[PDB]
A paper describes a structure:
Residues of the N-terminal domain residues assist the formation of a GSH binding site (G-site), whereas hydrophobic residues of the C-terminal domain form the hydrophobic substrate binding site (H-site).
Sh101 and sh155 were crystallized with two and three molecules in the asymmetric unit, respectively. Amino acid sequence alignments of the sh101 with the parent enzyme AmGSTF showed 94.98% identity. In particular, the Tm values of sh101 and sh155 enzyme variants were significantly increased by 8.3 and 5.2 °C compared to the parent enzyme AmGSTF.
Residue numbers in the entry:
A (entry chain B): 2 to 36, 50 to 216
B (entry chain A): 2 to 34, 51 to 216
Write the structure that this text describes.
Amino acid sequence: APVKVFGPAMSTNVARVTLCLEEVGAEYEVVNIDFNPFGQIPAFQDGDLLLWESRAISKYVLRKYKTDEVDLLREGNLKEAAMVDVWTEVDAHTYNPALSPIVYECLINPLMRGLPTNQTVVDESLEKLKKVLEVYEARLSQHKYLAGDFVSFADLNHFPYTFYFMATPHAALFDSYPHVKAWWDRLMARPAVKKIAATMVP
Amino acid sequence: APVKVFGPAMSTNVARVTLCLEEVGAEYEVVNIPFGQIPAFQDGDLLLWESRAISKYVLRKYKTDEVDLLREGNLKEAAMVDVWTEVDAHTYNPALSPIVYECLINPLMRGLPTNQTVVDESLEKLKKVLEVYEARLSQHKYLAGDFVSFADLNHFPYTFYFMATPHAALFDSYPHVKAWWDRLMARPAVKKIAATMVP
């Protein structure tokens, strides 16, 4: 019984769910656009369970399909799970609020509506993001991935908005942070990530 | 062996961690390093940051059949805990916290005038959030089901400071939300932490 994801595949929050589903090898069906295509929250159905909110859906998927091969939350190991949780929360409350206004001002608003970019909002965000990337640079100088030497929910959570940031004029900023840039290219080589990236087209 | 929390007891995010420690009956120290400062935490050689990550580590480590606040052995119950934890983080708290800043934090710590127009932008926005809470808590005593969980405890710190602003009586128009808030305030762990967010 394939689970159902409701929403536009190019939404950052729908792509978070489908990336998790691809990383665990689950079969699923994506059901149509809306009723913003870049931000809309997914609904989800697995049998009689109906869920909302992409982070809760994603964690349900990573638990239900966990194997010894594929354990992206590490819940049996409290130290590892704690590090997954830490960098999941850094994404949600620190990295994404610094990066997503750049994506909206430079990519989404011009692309969807021909709206002008507000360079003052973008510039505030860039200075905030630069301080954040200094922290990621030190972390990813110690480990291949954010939670340790294994890929996890923490890394996957960074994919959808960062992918769109890479289509703005500021993508070159990551080159000032070579270990962050190395980590980004590691993620972009994963076959599940390439699969979802091909779905994220306007 | 006791664990250490780093940060001010007053902080909304330190209180999330200390409430979790009190509900599991854990032995801990608090070491004072505005109302939103992110805590650090030490257990042996494990050093953590971010109150929700620390809180979950605590609720897993000290878990018992009496105190299972994450519900991780039942994927469907854990899903509902996660849903309402996210609603708190990205919907309820962004509605509620600017009322705390512009009625309580900024007029009594930063010396700013109480911007009584972003207060009404937040109030009208909080009103439509509470409608959804009122429907949810009308067929469950708690957010994740008929059991208290991390989802409910997550709402305590900011709601405790909202309850100290002029607009505390807004909950009275949502009787199932009010009755839910009353069940949380009656817990001994909650009463004990509430006493720390004041001196």
